[PDB]
């Protein structure tokens, strides 16, 4: 499918489930297309194909169902927040004001004001 | 219709419904034109054709009706807000101050201050 | 009328009503000229012709009448505000701080602080 | 009058009234000169001629009289404020922070916090 | 007088009164020189001649007298403030944040919060 | 494995444990790939291979388990916060506002206001 | 005196009084040198000669005496503040945020909040 | 060792202690490598070798032990804070806002508000 | 003395007193060197010679003595503050936000809020 | 010593005391090297030699001793703060916002609000 076709589902259905799950977990678009649909990027307009598959009625319904079926503890739980802030702290590409603010917020969260 | 004609409706009516629904859901203009009306972009002035079809009395009336007929729980419900903030968190193109602020707001929302 | 003439009304009167209505609804100038008066842009100074037709006594009086005759619920009602903020959220051209602030305000409005 | 002459009034008096009225309504200078005095711009220094006619004793006195004679409801009344903010909202050239702030203020004004 | 001479007064005295009055009303320097003393600009250093005539004892004394003799209602009265803010609002060269702030302050002044 | 293959685990399993541990400790991606998988960077798209191995079901499950199994005292304890702020203070590449803020926060934490 | 000589006073004494008075009134240096000492600028280093004459013991003592002898009503009295803010308002070179702030402060001062 | 080898310890053990101590005192990485391991920089990727030696299990364990064994008075004691702020004050490369803020904080700390 | 020699005092002692006094009054370095030691700048590194003479034990002791011997009314007394703010107001090179803030502070100081 | 050698002390010991004293007083590094060790800069990497001599155990111990032996009145006493702020005020290279803030803080300190 190198064209821009919304309705071609029920033939490639297992691939659409991987895309829906990876998207509902929260990772961005664009790349997930590279992951699941290979290097079909730059076929025509890549954004066109991406948002064309982003508009399937099958997509929309299954995405809404899976999104509403996930409890709000597999998306944001305290330990993941600590890990994300720590990732931002230890990355030497985040500029320095952002690292300072991340240290501030890790300080505020875990009552670590010298105690 | 490669011209800029407001009133040519009642001949292409199913296409106007897809456009109205996709727009009322909230996605931007410009691209939705690429989606539903193919690659007729850059025919003349693309913005001219877009806002010419954006000014149909048929458009305006049906858009207002469908917009007022949608309950305020298919546009913004808490779980969609969590998913959008998480999308902004896990995207490595959002600069770093925005990611920090998104983490802050996800922190504030779900009472996740170490509890 | 490729010149800059204020008083030439009562001959083209139906076109002036479309312009007045589209302007009173709130959309910007410049383009509405492209819409209703074709591609007569860049005839001389486009801004000159635009603000020359923007200064007709007939214009001013009818614009004031139609503007004062519109109830303040066809301009800003809550559901339109929700739709505009959602448009700004789902547009991937709005930079990232603006998207974060739009999410914040949609959060504040519809009491959606985890409830 | 392609020179820079303050006192040449009482010969061109109807043109000076249109200029005074358009200026007292609040629109900017520079262009109003293009409107009422044709394309005599760039004759010498355009700003020189503009502020030379801006310094006539006849001008000053009539401008002060007409400015003090206008009630403060033909300049700023609530419905005009709503229309101006809406113009700023629907213009796709206003950057995105300004549009967000305009939405905020339209929100604050018309008690539209979900009610 | 194409030189830089402070004391040459009592010969050109009517011109010095126009300059003093235009300056005491509040308009900037530089141009007022163009207005009253023609196009003698760029003779030598224009700023040199301007601030040389700005330092006459005759100037200083008459300027102080006329400045202290003007009541504080020909400089700033409410209606002039409304007109200046409206000028800043309707000028399409003022950037967009300044226009928003001007609308805010016009809102604050004339108790126009939906009332 | 110079391709982009998610499921090739159970053959290289000890390498996946080092990656999981180094990532769960908080250091960034990209480099950890250089560390554990040599200089296989720029094989194709490096980000593609990185986030392809970042999407293994085996990865996800083991990463979640190890992340939830680590007590919140091997990630952020007070002495590590002091050391990180001190690192930011003594690094002559952090610009000067960030160093000032780091000194401020080290001041605030350890009650060192002249006492 | 095209050199840089501090002590050459008591020969040119009337010129030093004009300089002291113009400086004590508050106008900047550099130009006052152009005014009183002609176009001797760029002789060597202009700043060198300026601050060399700025360091005379005769200068310092007379400057201190004249500065302490001036009452604090020939430097800042309310009407001069109004005139300076008005100058900043009516100058079309002051950018637009500064003009807005000047209007704000003129508003705050003269109790002109619609009264 | 011009390669990138984690486990080569117990042969060069005294050098690893100097590195651990200098790092635990708080000075940055990169240079400490230049200090203790000579000019082996730019062998391959310098950051690669640096963070490869930064990931030794021997390193990690000894670094954690020495870091937890240092009392919080050899890292930040009041007199060191005064010295660091004074260093930032007397350095003519710190820009001017940072110097002003450093003076402010030195003012706040040592109760030096004219007393 | 075109070299960089700290101890050469007791031969040139009157020059060192002028430097100490001019520095203790508060004017910057660099230029004072031009003033008292002629045009010996750019001999080698000018900053090197300047801070070499800035490090004499004789210098340090006499500078400390003279600095501690000056009462805190020859450095900052109210009338000097008024004069400095007025200098900043009347200088047309200070940008416009700084001039506005200077007017604000002169307003705040001398109780000149319309009284 | 044109190499990078930490331990070569007890031969050049008087030079190390001057360096320690000048550093403990608070002046920056880099230049102090130029002062005490001549023009040996750019021998290899200047920063390398500087921080190599900055890491001597003899250095560290004597620096700590001398730093802890200095009373907190030879580093920051009120009169030095007044002198530093005055230096920043009278330097015409400090930009204008910094000068304004320095005037503000000198105002705040010495109770000089018109009294």
Coordinates of N, CA, C and O in Angstrom, one line a residue, chain H residues 22 27 31-32 34 39 74 77 79 82-83 86-87 89-91 96-97 99-100 103-104 106-107 112-115, chain J residues 23 25-28 45 47-48 51-52 60 63-64 67 70 75-78 85 88 94 98 101-102 105 109 111:
Chain H
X22 N 38.6 12.6 42.6 CA 38.4 13.9 42.0 C 36.9 14.1 41.5 O 36.4 15.2 41.5
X27 N 34.2 17.9 40.7 CA 34.7 18.5 39.4 C 34.1 17.7 38.3 O 33.9 16.5 38.4
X31 N 37.5 16.6 31.6 CA 38.9 17.0 31.9 C 39.6 16.1 32.8 O 40.8 15.8 32.5
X32 N 39.0 15.6 33.8 CA 39.6 14.7 34.7 C 40.3 13.5 34.0 O 41.3 13.0 34.4
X34 N 41.6 13.9 31.0 CA 42.8 14.5 30.5 C 43.9 14.5 31.6 O 45.1 14.3 31.3
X39 N 46.8 12.7 27.5 CA 46.2 13.2 26.3 C 45.7 12.1 25.4 O 45.7 12.3 24.1
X74 N 32.4 18.7 53.8 CA 33.5 18.9 52.9 C 33.0 19.2 51.5 O 33.8 19.3 50.6
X77 N 30.1 24.1 52.8 CA 30.1 24.8 54.1 C 30.0 26.3 53.8 O 30.5 26.7 52.7
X79 N 31.5 29.0 54.3 CA 32.7 29.8 53.8 C 33.0 29.5 52.3 O 33.4 30.4 51.6
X82 N 30.5 31.5 50.3 CA 30.9 32.9 50.2 C 32.1 33.0 49.2 O 32.1 34.0 48.4
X83 N 33.0 32.1 49.2 CA 34.1 32.2 48.3 C 33.7 32.0 46.8 O 34.2 32.7 45.9
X86 N 31.9 35.1 45.7 CA 32.9 36.2 45.5 C 33.7 35.9 44.2 O 34.0 36.9 43.5
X87 N 34.1 34.7 43.9 CA 34.7 34.4 42.6 C 33.8 34.8 41.5 O 34.3 35.4 40.5
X89 N 31.6 37.2 41.5 CA 31.6 38.7 41.5 C 32.8 39.3 40.8 O 32.7 40.2 40.0
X90 N 34.0 38.8 41.2 CA 35.2 39.4 40.7 C 35.7 38.9 39.4 O 36.8 39.3 38.9
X91 N 35.0 38.0 38.7 CA 35.4 37.6 37.4 C 34.8 38.5 36.3 O 33.5 38.6 36.2
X96 N 26.8 40.9 33.2 CA 26.6 41.9 34.3 C 25.4 41.6 35.1 O 25.4 41.9 36.4
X97 N 24.3 41.0 34.6 CA 23.2 40.6 35.4 C 23.5 39.5 36.4 O 23.1 39.6 37.5
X99 N 26.5 39.1 37.8 CA 27.3 39.8 38.9 C 26.3 40.6 39.8 O 26.5 40.5 41.0
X100 N 25.4 41.2 39.2 CA 24.4 41.9 40.1 C 23.7 41.0 41.0 O 23.5 41.2 42.2
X103 N 25.9 39.8 43.8 CA 26.0 40.8 44.9 C 24.8 40.8 45.7 O 24.8 41.0 46.9
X104 N 23.6 40.7 45.1 CA 22.3 40.6 45.8 C 22.4 39.5 46.8 O 21.9 39.7 48.0
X106 N 25.0 37.7 48.1 CA 26.0 38.0 49.1 C 25.4 39.0 50.1 O 25.7 39.0 51.3
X107 N 24.6 40.0 49.7 CA 24.0 40.9 50.5 C 23.0 40.3 51.4 O 23.0 40.5 52.7
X112 N 23.9 42.2 55.6 CA 24.9 43.3 55.4 C 24.1 44.5 54.9 O 24.6 45.4 54.2
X113 N 22.8 44.5 55.2 CA 21.9 45.6 54.8 C 22.2 46.8 55.6 O 21.5 47.2 56.5
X114 N 23.4 47.4 55.3 CA 23.9 48.6 56.0 C 24.2 48.4 57.5 O 24.4 49.3 58.3
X115 N 24.2 47.1 57.9 CA 24.5 46.7 59.3 C 25.6 45.7 59.3 O 25.7 44.8 58.4
Chain J
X23 N 44.2 33.5 45.0 CA 43.0 32.8 44.7 C 42.0 32.8 45.8 O 40.8 32.9 45.6
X25 N 41.7 35.1 48.0 CA 41.0 36.4 48.1 C 39.8 36.5 47.1 O 38.9 37.3 47.4
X26 N 39.8 35.7 46.1 CA 38.6 35.5 45.3 C 38.8 35.8 43.8 O 37.9 35.5 43.0
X27 N 39.9 36.4 43.3 CA 40.1 36.6 41.9 C 40.1 35.4 41.1 O 40.5 34.3 41.6
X28 N 39.8 35.5 39.9 CA 39.6 34.3 39.0 C 40.9 33.6 38.7 O 42.0 34.1 38.9
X45 N 47.8 22.7 26.2 CA 46.5 23.2 26.6 C 46.6 24.0 27.9 O 47.0 23.4 29.0
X47 N 44.3 25.3 29.9 CA 43.4 24.9 30.9 C 43.9 23.6 31.5 O 43.7 23.3 32.7
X48 N 44.5 22.7 30.7 CA 45.1 21.5 31.3 C 46.1 21.8 32.3 O 46.1 21.2 33.4
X51 N 44.3 23.4 35.6 CA 43.6 22.5 36.5 C 44.5 21.4 36.9 O 44.1 20.6 37.8
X52 N 45.7 21.2 36.3 CA 46.6 20.2 36.8 C 47.3 20.8 38.1 O 47.5 20.0 39.1
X60 N 45.6 21.7 47.5 CA 44.3 21.5 48.2 C 44.4 21.7 49.7 O 43.5 22.4 50.3
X63 N 45.2 25.5 50.5 CA 44.1 26.3 50.1 C 43.0 26.1 51.1 O 42.4 27.2 51.5
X64 N 42.6 24.9 51.5 CA 41.6 24.7 52.5 C 41.9 25.4 53.8 O 41.1 26.1 54.4
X67 N 41.8 29.2 53.4 CA 40.4 29.6 53.2 C 39.6 29.6 54.5 O 38.8 30.5 54.7
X70 N 40.5 32.6 57.1 CA 40.2 34.0 56.8 C 38.8 34.4 57.4 O 37.8 33.7 57.1
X75 N 36.4 39.5 53.2 CA 35.8 39.1 51.9 C 34.7 40.0 51.6 O 34.7 40.6 50.5
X76 N 33.7 40.1 52.4 CA 32.5 41.0 52.2 C 32.2 41.7 53.4 O 31.6 41.2 54.4
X77 N 32.5 43.0 53.4 CA 32.0 44.0 54.4 C 31.3 45.1 53.7 O 31.5 45.3 52.5
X78 N 30.4 45.8 54.4 CA 29.4 46.7 53.7 C 30.0 47.7 52.8 O 29.5 47.9 51.7
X85 N 29.0 48.0 43.9 CA 27.9 48.5 43.2 C 28.2 49.8 42.5 O 27.7 50.1 41.4
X88 N 30.0 49.3 39.3 CA 29.1 48.8 38.3 C 28.2 50.0 37.7 O 27.9 50.0 36.6
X94 N 28.2 48.4 30.9 CA 27.5 47.4 31.8 C 26.1 47.3 31.2 O 25.3 46.7 31.9
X98 N 21.3 46.7 33.8 CA 22.2 46.4 34.9 C 22.5 47.7 35.7 O 22.5 47.7 37.0
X101 N 19.4 48.5 37.7 CA 19.2 47.7 38.9 C 20.2 48.0 40.0 O 19.9 47.9 41.2
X102 N 21.5 48.3 39.6 CA 22.5 48.7 40.6 C 22.1 50.0 41.3 O 22.2 50.1 42.6
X105 N 19.4 49.0 43.9 CA 19.9 48.3 45.1 C 20.7 49.2 46.0 O 20.6 49.1 47.2
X109 N 19.6 49.7 49.9 CA 20.5 49.5 51.0 C 20.6 50.7 51.9 O 20.2 50.6 53.1
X111 N 19.0 53.3 52.8 CA 17.8 54.0 53.2 C 17.7 55.4 52.6 O 17.4 56.4 53.3

